[PDB]
Design a protein around this ligand. Structure first.
Ligand SMILES: Nc1ncnc2c1ncn2[C@@H]1O[C@H](COP(=O)(O)OP(=O)(O)NP(=O)(O)O)[C@@H](O)[C@H]1O
Ligand SMILES: [Mn+2]
Ligand SMILES: [Mn+2]
Lengths: 10, 317
């Protein structure tokens, strides 16, 4: 199925 | 000067933790665009000004058939707005989720267009860093339109490096999960993950917990369906090689290594960039306001300086 993926930045 | 009142706000196309993308119509021309709206207070508080300015700069200085083009870039007292060309066909994520898997020929078409776009970005000293199905759109004709230049880095020529720990968890390259710096080869890993998803119907590595996911990306070996062609197995093994120096596209010739791989033998690279090839799928939109290729989770929702000096823009086209 795979849910929506969100980006990040440290 | 471009204002908020110059546009009609129709419906929500996408929503993130840091921004909203709305389908807009320019009142004076009647033309439809996708407006990405970001809140200034959220950006300043999380110290993400540098990345937001770079997003505008990349959109201002890029011109390629497979990259979303910027029409206007303006700001208000509390918001930052990017007026981009509208990709009527939705995300590649929408289509792949519905169809479960694409044929190798269909994945090759999309893959070739993404390689063309990445070759262009790398030639302009830009590393994308966020290749994912949610960032790969389809235009009204069925061609790829890369959107979301939010994590791009400028001035990265040849073997130059970057230090920011960023990207999308499920798509991070092994070297990004290690200390210190990394090169442009991270984009080829990203391409490998999307090509794997398109041809195998799942992510190469997955776990809901980020700590376990990162261990898989760094330590686990990729598996391939028995029926996958030898050229596809070779492409995926090459793009998903953990060591960036051993990766396909990780060498000094960058995109040339990916372009010359046997999986792409049937591809004429000039025909790709010149849009001469017939798309395997053409979006069946009946109007410019038809959002059938965007998730109902978003479209059903109701929609009620010195620091940002290099932000503003008005296009020549
Ligand atoms: N030009 C466009 N045309 C149509 N839809 C678009 C366009 N740009 C973005 N979208 C949609 O809006 C969603 C979010 O926009 P995006 O620019 O990726 O925001 P973001 O906050 O940077 N997301 P992320 O960093 O991936 O967590 C995308 O995943 C698309 O579904
Ligand atoms: Mn995105
Ligand atoms: Mn982003």
């Amino acid at each position: 199925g795979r849910p929506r993926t969100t980006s990040f930045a440290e | 000067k471009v204002t908020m009142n110059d546009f009609d706000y129709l419906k929500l196309l996408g929503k993130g933790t840091f921004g909203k993308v709305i389908l807009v119509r320019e009142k004076a021309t009647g033309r439809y665009y996708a407006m990405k709206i970001l809140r200034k207070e959220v950006i300043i508080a999380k110290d993400e000004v540098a990345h937001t300015v770079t997003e505008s700069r990349v959109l201002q200085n890029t011109r390629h058939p497979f990259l979303t083009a910027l029409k206007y870039a303006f700001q208000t007292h509390d918001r930052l707005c990017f007026v981009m060309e509208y990709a009527n066909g939705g995300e590649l994520f929408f289509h792949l989720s519905r169809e479960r898997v694409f044929t190798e020929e269909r994945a090759r078409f999309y893959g070739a267009e993404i390689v063309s776009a990445l070759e262009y970005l790398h030639s302009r000293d830009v590393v994308y860093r966020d290749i994912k199905l949610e960032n790969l759109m389809l235009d009204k004709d069925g061609h790829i339109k890369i959107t979301d230049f939010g994590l791009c880095k400028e001035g990265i020529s040849d073997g130059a490096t970057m230090k920011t720990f960023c990207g999308t968890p499920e798509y991070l390259a092994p070297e990004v999960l290690e200390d210190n710096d990394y090169g442009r080869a991270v984009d080829w890993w990203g391409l490998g993950v999307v090509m794997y998803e398109m041809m195998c119907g799942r992510l190469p590595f997955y776990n809901q917990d980020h700590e376990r996911l990162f261990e898989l990306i760094l330590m686990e070996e990729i598996r391939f369906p028995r029926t996958l062609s030898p050229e596809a197995k070779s492409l995926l093994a090459g793009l998903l090689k953990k060591d960036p120096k051993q990766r396909l596209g990780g060498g000094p010739s960058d995109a040339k290594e990916v372009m010359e791989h046997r999986f792409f033998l049937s591809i004429n690279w000039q025909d790709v960039v010149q849009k001469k090839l017939l798309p395997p799928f053409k979006p069946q939109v009946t109007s410019e306001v038809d959002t059938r290729y965007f998730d109902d989770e978003f479209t059903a929702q109701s929609i009620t300086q010195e620091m940002f000096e290099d932000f503003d823009y008005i296009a020549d086209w």
